[PDB]
């Protein structure tokens, strides 16, 4: 299930030369003298969209199987936490879309993209780690509920 992703990234590693460039300085008109170049690490947004769409389809399949696991009993059933994680991840990876793409028309401080990505990613991780393993550590460390 990771193979298609791996293929993906290698394909980008031959389609996109992966070169960094000092951004051409139309981030601000240079006539007002205090104009800046944010040294953007130029990675094409299409690769980001493709990789995230792959993860979205993968998590759609995860949600489908979580729904189908409704009848699982006791500690082996975690369909509801998984659905909660998927809802939170969808909201996160949708709240990401307007700032990164739409707001990017605002030339001033374009590196708000970088944070809008990183924060979003570490939030999604903070969900998958939290709602899946905190309700699993809280016992082992607090409640000797089981042998």
């Amino acid at each position: 299930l990771i193979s298609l992703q791996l293929l993906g990234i290698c394909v980008w590693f031959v389609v996109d030369p992966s070169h960094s460039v000092v951004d051409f300085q139309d981030q601000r008109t240079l006539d007002p003298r205090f104009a800046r170049g944010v040294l953007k690490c130029d990675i094409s947004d299409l690769s980001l969209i493709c990789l995230l769409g792959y993860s979205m389809l993968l998590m759609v399949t995860c949600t489908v199987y979580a729904i189908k696991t409704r009848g699982v009993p006791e500690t082996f059933n975690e369909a509801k936490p998984i659905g909660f994680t998927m809802y939170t991840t969808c909201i996160v990876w949708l709240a990401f879309i307007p700032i990164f793409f739409g707001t990017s028309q605002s030339a001033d401080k374009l590196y708000i993209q970088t944070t809008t990505l990183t924060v979003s990613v570490s939030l999604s991780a903070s969900v998958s780690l939290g709602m899946l393993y905190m309700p699993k550590v809280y016992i082992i460390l607090f409640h000797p509920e089981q042998n």
Binding site: Y87, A95, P98, G102
Partner: protein
């Protein structure tokens, strides 16, 4: 398109310079210009009005929100029809009627708010936006707070008293939006910027990011309704309709916590801001429906014997 640049000098020999492309020609010897948001005449004989731009009914940026809004409105209509003409069961009759029909009314109003939003904004539609984008959420979260308050009490209560609680929570938001309309008159929506005279919109004249104040009360509503939905998680009511309320409150809080900063940042661009408004309202309505009435609807359709 050109003016004779002056030099009295030795003799009356003129230069020629084209005017600023937004500056017209009212004198042969000097250009002329008019206010921002305006434009030069083709022969540069005066000021001309660039045509107002807005999110139109059929454009690509409104098709998605209007489609999700209409589908959600039809789904809410079906849900309320089933809960009205099939309410004899205790799953609805003993946990419903007009109380908890307030939920469906609020969901319908939320869904129609997207219809309200994508329209001509210059007219009183600004007033409709200012009142409704608050009141639609106020209805839903106030009725949810009434439900969780009741469950916490059983964790005065009477049908008319529940209606009164909902009405008072609604009157709070109505008074706050009335105070806002007192602060800022509604309408007169238009504006452009130094940059261009070639890009104009009918964005509402209410001050940017001010309506978040009207939403503050809604946020407080959530900040209570989640808390009580926590405290009441242990009590199994009819089909244990508690866990569902907690799920709904958590999902709505998750939506809000990202939706508010998203609006605040995207306020620079009107298109993405309005699309976000419509999508967030539709998402809140859909999550309320499919997290609260979905189990009851499942019970009353696929298990009619209950």
């Amino acid at each position: 398109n050109e003016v004779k640049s002056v030099q009295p000098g030795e003799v009356c020999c003129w230069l020629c310079i084209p005017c600023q492309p937004y500056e017209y020609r009212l004198d042969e010897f000097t250009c002329a210009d008019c206010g921002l948001g305006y434009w030069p005449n083709a022969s540069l004989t005066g000021c001309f009005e660039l045509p107002q731009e807005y999110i139109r009914w059929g454009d690509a940026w409104a098709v998605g929100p209007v489609t999700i809004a209409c589908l959600g409105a039809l789904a809410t209509l079906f849900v309320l029809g089933v809960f009205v003409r099939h309410n004899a069961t205790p799953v609805v009759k003993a946990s419903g009627r007009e109380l908890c029909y307030i939920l469906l009314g609020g969901v319908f109003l939320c869904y129609c708010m997207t219809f309200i939003f994508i329209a001509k904004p210059s007219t009183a539609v600004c007033t409709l936006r200012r009142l409704g984008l608050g009141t639609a959420f106020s209805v839903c979260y106030s009725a949810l707070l009434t439900k969780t308050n009741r469950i916490a009490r059983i964790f005065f209560i009477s049908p008319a008293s529940q209606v009164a609680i909902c009405l008072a929570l609604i009157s709070g938001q109505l008074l706050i939006v009335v105070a806002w309309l007192v602060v800022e008159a509604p309408g007169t929506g238009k504006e452009t910027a130094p940059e261009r005279r070639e890009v104009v919109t009918l964005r509402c004249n209410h001050r940017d990011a001010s309506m978040l104040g009207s939403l503050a009360y809604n946020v407080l509503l959530i900040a209570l309704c989640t808390l009580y939905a926590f405290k009441t998680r242990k009590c199994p009511e009819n089909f244990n309709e508690a866990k569902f309320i907690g799920f709904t409150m958590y999902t709505t809080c998750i939506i809000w916590l990202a939706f508010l900063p998203i609006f605040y940042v995207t306020s620079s661009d009107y298109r993405v801001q309005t699309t976000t408004m419509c999508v967030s309202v539709s998402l809140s309505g859909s999550v309320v429906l499919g997290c609260l009435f979905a189990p009851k609807l499942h019970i009353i359709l696929f298990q009619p014997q209950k």
